[PDB]
Design an enzyme around this catalytic site. Sequence first.
Site, PDB file in Angstrom:
ATOM      1  N   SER A   1       0.849  -1.191   0.000  1.00 52.01           N
ATOM      2  CA  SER A   1       0.000   0.000   0.000  1.00 52.01           C
ATOM      3  C   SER A   1       0.890   1.249   0.000  1.00 52.01           C
ATOM      4  O   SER A   1       1.689   1.448   0.919  1.00 52.01           O
ATOM      5  CB  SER A   1      -0.945  -0.005   1.172  1.00 52.01           C
ATOM      6  OG  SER A   1      -1.681   1.207   1.239  1.00 52.01           O
ATOM      7  N   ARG A   2       0.735   2.082  -1.036  1.00 51.80           N
ATOM      8  CA  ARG A   2       1.600   3.236  -1.279  1.00 51.80           C
ATOM      9  C   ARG A   2       1.222   4.391  -0.341  1.00 51.80           C
ATOM     10  O   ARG A   2       2.089   5.170   0.060  1.00 51.80           O
ATOM     11  CB  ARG A   2       1.519   3.641  -2.754  1.00 51.80           C
ATOM     12  CG  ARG A   2       2.119   2.607  -3.696  1.00 51.80           C
ATOM     13  CD  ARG A   2       2.504   3.181  -5.048  1.00 51.80           C
ATOM     14  NE  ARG A   2       3.535   4.204  -4.938  1.00 51.80           N
ATOM     15  CZ  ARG A   2       4.823   3.963  -4.714  1.00 51.80           C
ATOM     16  NH1 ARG A   2       5.253   2.721  -4.562  1.00 51.80           N
ATOM     17  NH2 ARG A   2       5.679   4.966  -4.638  1.00 51.80           N
ATOM     18  N   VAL A   3      -0.068   4.494  -0.003  1.00 55.65           N
ATOM     19  CA  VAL A   3      -0.565   5.489   0.948  1.00 55.65           C
ATOM     20  C   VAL A   3      -0.128   5.070   2.358  1.00 55.65           C
ATOM     21  O   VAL A   3       0.499   5.849   3.077  1.00 55.65           O
ATOM     22  CB  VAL A   3      -2.094   5.657   0.843  1.00 55.65           C
ATOM     23  CG1 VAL A   3      -2.643   6.583   1.920  1.00 55.65           C
ATOM     24  CG2 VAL A   3      -2.510   6.142  -0.539  1.00 55.65           C
TER      25      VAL A   3
END
Lengths: 114, 114, 114, 145, 113, 248
Positions: free
Chosen positions: F101-103
Amino acid sequence: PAIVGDEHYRVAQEVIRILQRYKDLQDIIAILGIDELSEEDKQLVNRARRIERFLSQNMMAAEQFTGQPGSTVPLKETIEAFDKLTKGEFDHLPEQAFFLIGGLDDLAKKAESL
Amino acid sequence: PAIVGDEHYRVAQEVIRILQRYKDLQDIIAILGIDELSEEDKQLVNRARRIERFLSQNMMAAEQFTGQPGSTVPLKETIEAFDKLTKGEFDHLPEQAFFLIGGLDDLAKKAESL
Amino acid sequence: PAIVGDEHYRVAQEVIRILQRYKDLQDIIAILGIDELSEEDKQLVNRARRIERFLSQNMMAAEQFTGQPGSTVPLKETIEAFDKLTKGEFDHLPEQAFFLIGGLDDLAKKAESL
Amino acid sequence: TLRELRGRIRSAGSIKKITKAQELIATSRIAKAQARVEAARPYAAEITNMLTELSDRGLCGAYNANVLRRAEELFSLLRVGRKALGYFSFTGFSERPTYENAREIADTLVNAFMATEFRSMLSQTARYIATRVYAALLEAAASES
Amino acid sequence: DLNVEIVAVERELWSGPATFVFTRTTAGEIGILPRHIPLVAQLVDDAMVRVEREGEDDLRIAVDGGFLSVTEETVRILVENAQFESEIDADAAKEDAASDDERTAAWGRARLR
Amino acid sequence: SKQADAYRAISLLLRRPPGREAFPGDVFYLHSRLLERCAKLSDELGGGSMTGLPIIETKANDISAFIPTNVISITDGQCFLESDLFNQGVRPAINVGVSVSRVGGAAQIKAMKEVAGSLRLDLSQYRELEAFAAFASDLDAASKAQLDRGARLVELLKQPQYSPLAVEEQVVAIFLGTQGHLDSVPVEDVQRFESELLEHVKASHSDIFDGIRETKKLSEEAEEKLVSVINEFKKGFXXXXXXXXXXX
């Protein structure tokens, strides 16, 4: 067997059988080695390696490459040699004795030096 | 679980779990074997192999192929059979007993002959 | 050695050697620990850990993250610092002294407080 | 075909971890073996003072091969463990063996009369009789690991 | 005092300087105190007592083994299977008196209790 | 995947020159414009959102393929599902190492951020160790505890189909495993322990759930409350396989 006689055919195929089994065990030997193989397989691998190295031969053209002069081996010498190897008469001799030799006399001569 | 009930779903997935783990260990078994596996894994492999062979069944169409006539196994017989296999009630029976059989009676009948 | 001189090259590689050996012993330390390592290895591990923590540095951009302001370390300070660490002049100092510091003065200043 | 190659990568990848695991498990058993020998040595020393006053598992390289080679050679010139018993024919000894394991066999050997040296991790060279049997067993257990 | 070393074949238990030691041997019930003659003696299936400068004298089992003593102030005791009372309990020895070979070990463990 | 195949058909019929895997040049551009429109607007433009869950069908777990790589490079993280894991019993079959997950923590409430901060680290250590697990009691103490912990954490991550859990229920379930409240309980009985525990807390100790909903954090009071609730439940809980065990 028609052209080259039953003996030659028998020895030729028997050599191929040994080399084939050796090639099959390459994957297992790569990881574990010779130790995990059975008593029969251990001997077959030993013979196979010695057969592979005996198939090597000095070439008349390759004097500049190797250094030593080439050797020519008659048919009778060839048949008799691989006959003795398959039976396991030269199990005592080292691996280096088989490397780059023509006749059977040259095998025994190099065996003493080592 | 909605359509085919909780029991069927439980047994179905549990069989898949055993066969999946067996497939994962194929690479390790190929080199090392059964010896290096743990007591639990040894039993799982034994059960997995027996489950694979029990999944085999005689076909009505395949009389010319196999020789023996086909067998039809009801749903209740199927569920109960794989239930007993997963629990390990048929650990004593040989591998050949599971090969190409329908009902549970035919397993026990062939077990005695062997 | 041509572009950057012999000293820098010598120190750079010597640091890598220590960190490499530390990484190799991770597997052994995970099970057995520090006890089984030899007197020489024990010291190398101690130095390696201290070198890892000295490589950490305060960033000018990271004021919001850390809290303290950043530090810039010239080339001469860098070379001299790792020279003393490899020789083992700062074996007495604790591990916390090396954490998140720029110059050598700041190491000694934090050492007294602890 | 990729299918074959992808499976071989999975195969070798898995086997690597298994070999790497059994490597470090053997690294643990050497430490316990040596620690057991440290306890055994001073006991035999105290026994000798008085008398003077008066493998199962494989994957052990050339451990069995070296021992059996010396054995076969010594027997030919002059005249315990499933692996060895197998070779001689053509058990279930623990990794950390106690005395109760080698009590019965020691007694029978003593009654008959009445009626692998550890160097390094790489290098291994192939009443009172009961202790001798055990003293060898630990050094053998060490050499095996 | 003498440095009494209670050792087992598996591991060394203790090596503390006791004032005296009492145990039953094949010959008799010997009491080895400081300045004793160099003697060799086998032990029998019975208990023994170790008395240290301070604290209560602990008592321990010895199924098999012997007892050592020399000119030098060094007592040593070798036992095949030793047991210290601490938290043994069980009293299996009594129930294991049926078998003769086990009665041997039992008789040693029983007298300690 | 099928929408890409559809556009490939159109382009080839129109006699547009093909590229890699017989796709047109603007097959990446196709997915780019689509996905980018999904965004979180500024406060000036209301502050509305539009979350995207695109799907791609890989062939023999081939992430390297053209269309997958295109969409992976566009999206803000991926949830790689595996066949081997799915069949082995891990459902959902999300590969932890590959999935990202980049967030990240920004899209998590503080309660989840704290409990599942070092959940990822523990399971990364577990997979590294996992090989050693088969060889029981040949290891030290530290590694053994990690394997026993890790094995139980896997069972918590398993979830049945069409059964979404509330955020407050998840945090409690993870808090249970991470702190080591399931260490006493067998691994096979972890799933049933989780279900019955949540039922108990839902009925009796709703205040704990309510607290997490409002505050969006686990209080020191709630921690001590949970510990007592777990211990009491363990005594009541009849272990399915073999004898029962509460604490030691």
